[PDB]
């Protein structure tokens, strides 16, 4: 009926001052939209920062302060910290209910960047000899946690059959995440060569391998 | 002038029991200004106080639009007695 | 409850009060409340007060009957008092 | 300080119904209105419905009207929310949140609650079927080597991977589980340095105690 659009992820400094929007499908976003912003931690940790009108939740920042910029809702962070960086989640008031946006995951480097270390497993002989032969593709040490894996088989990319995690945090708050690809056993004798195509920020790294 | 546009408004088929039209489905916004005149006879007893105010509302009705603005008619009509809009 | 200068609400109750009447017999509903009054203050504006009064009045009979000054102040005084709070 | 404690985990068949509870505490219950909101995989972040502890009336979302029911004790500060006609889509994460203003709808959220994950589905309980995985050999290791082990078909979660039955505890990459079909599947990774690889033995260690599953695999090298 209605869908709010927020940014897929962003990146900011310690220090620095960063915008995130939420944008709604039915036109400008007015004060009787009732602008919410949501937080989201890390093992599934909520908390609201800005709502409704003028209101604030307790014990919320300073540096966090909302607003509506052009014709959309806006949450700005002046003076962005470590902790800072999580999910934030907007809302939009209908009236009849509320809807969230697709939330947009926010980082705030504590490290300099890191480009992922990208393997890939081809499926074991075990596994192999009977039901479904699988690709693995684990994505490690990367920073920020997005990336974008795509899949080739004999050089033409694979719609169907391709699953990948959520990045999760690793020890040194880097990110690490895994690609699965379902074949059948036939289907994987056939063709010549698979690949696992993973994009991080501007860069792009390239695994294969044949038989 | 103005008699002359108020009747063009309630010549078409108009419903002031009908809430006015949104462009997205959305409820009637009202803008409201209040001014205090008067506070007076406040009473411990009864745990009430007599006041007198003007309330001042605002809203939006394409219905009860009659022209652009770059038009030689004059920016509101005050509304006279016998035409209902809705409220 | 706090509503109330005078009582405090204690309980609500709903019930009915269906009766027969020379017309014929009408169904009726019968809302309940009932208000108990701030006995705090009459305690300790009016009882408490007078209690120790009537008990200051008592100690003009330990004193000796030379001590006029003494006892006719207090029983004197004692009644003033005692009519004020009346008032 | 304020809390939302909710009830625990639960998982249930399809067609069932259960009772989500959320317990208050650290202000007056009955001021602030409650919201409950599903997390799905699927699908986002989805608003169901608020209540108001005071008047006990309610406001659902329109997609969720009659799969959920918004109830409340006073007595005990709890707010429940009975979810009935349980299907593999109603399988998500619900949380409770707050209202912000104190005896009136402020439109705005203030505290949530640790989440409550149901699980709600048609499957039975399955032993996780572990297969190795080999490194590639078309590429330069000059430090160290990436092996690892796949858990594949293993319900419910979680299982647990350790290697060299603890051993090895450094340098372990257990990444998120995956739902392939009514069933789970996750892989771990442990990067060893060349040199002790494949000279000493690599084992992966996979524990499933809601089937009381422990089995073994060693890792062998790929021509
Ligand atoms: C209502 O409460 C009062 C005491 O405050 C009691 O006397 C009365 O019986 C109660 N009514 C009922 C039906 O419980």
Known sequence: QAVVTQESALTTSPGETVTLTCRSSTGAVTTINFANWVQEKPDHLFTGLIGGINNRAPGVPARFSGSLIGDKAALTITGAQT????????????????????????????????????????????????????????????????????????????????????????????????????????????????????????????????? | SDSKILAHLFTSGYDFRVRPPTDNGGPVVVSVNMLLRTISKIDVVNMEYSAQLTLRESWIDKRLSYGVKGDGQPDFVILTVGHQIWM | ??????????????????????????????????????????????????????????????????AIPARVTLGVTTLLTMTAQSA | ???????????????????????????????????????????????????????????????????????????????????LSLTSEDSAVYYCAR????????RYFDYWGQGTTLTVSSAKTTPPSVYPLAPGSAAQTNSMVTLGCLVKGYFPEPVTVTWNSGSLSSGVHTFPAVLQSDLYTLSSSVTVPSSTWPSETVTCNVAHPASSTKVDKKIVPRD
């Open chain 3, 1 to 66: 409850s706090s509503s109330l200068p005078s009582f405090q609400l204690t309980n609500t109750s709903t019930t009915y009060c269906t009766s027969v009447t020379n017309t014929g017999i009408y169904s009726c509903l019968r809302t309940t409340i009932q208000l108990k009054r701030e006995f705090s203050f009459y305690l300790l504006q009016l009882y408490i007060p007078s209690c120790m009064l009537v008990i200051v009045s008592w100690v003009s009979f330990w004193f000796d009957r030379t």
């Open chain 1, 83 to 211: 902790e800072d960086e999580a999910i934030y989640f907007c809302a939009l008031w209908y009236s009849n209910h509320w809807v969230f946006g697709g939330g947009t995951k926010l980082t705030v480097l504590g490290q300099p960047k890191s480009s992922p270390s990208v393997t890939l497993f081809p499926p074991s002989s075990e596994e192999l000899e009977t039901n479904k032969a699988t690709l693995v593709c684990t994505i490690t040490d990367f920073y920020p946690g997005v990336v974008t894996v795509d899949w080739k088989v004999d050089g033409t990319p694979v719609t169907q059959g391709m699953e990948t995690t959520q990045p999760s945090k690793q020890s040194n708050n880097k990110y690490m995440a895994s690609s699965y690809l379902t074949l059948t056993a036939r289907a994987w004798e056939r063709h010549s060569s698979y690949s696992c195509q993973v994009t991080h920020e501007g860069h792009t790294v390239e695994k294969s391998l044949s038989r």
């Open chain 4, 1 to 83: 300080e304020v809390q939302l404690q909710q009830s625990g985990p639960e998982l249930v068949r399809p067609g069932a119904s259960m009772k989500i509870s959320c317990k208050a505490s650290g202000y007056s219950f009955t001021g602030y209105t409650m919201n409950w909101v599903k997390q799905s995989h699927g699908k986002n972040l989805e608003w169901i419905g608020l209540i108001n502890p005071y008047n006990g009336g309610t406001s659902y979302n329109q997609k969720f009207k009659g799969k959920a029911t918004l109830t409340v004790d006073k007595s005990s500060s709890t707010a429940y929310m009975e979810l």
């Open chain 4, 99 to 106: 209202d912000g203003d104190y005896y009136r709808y402020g």
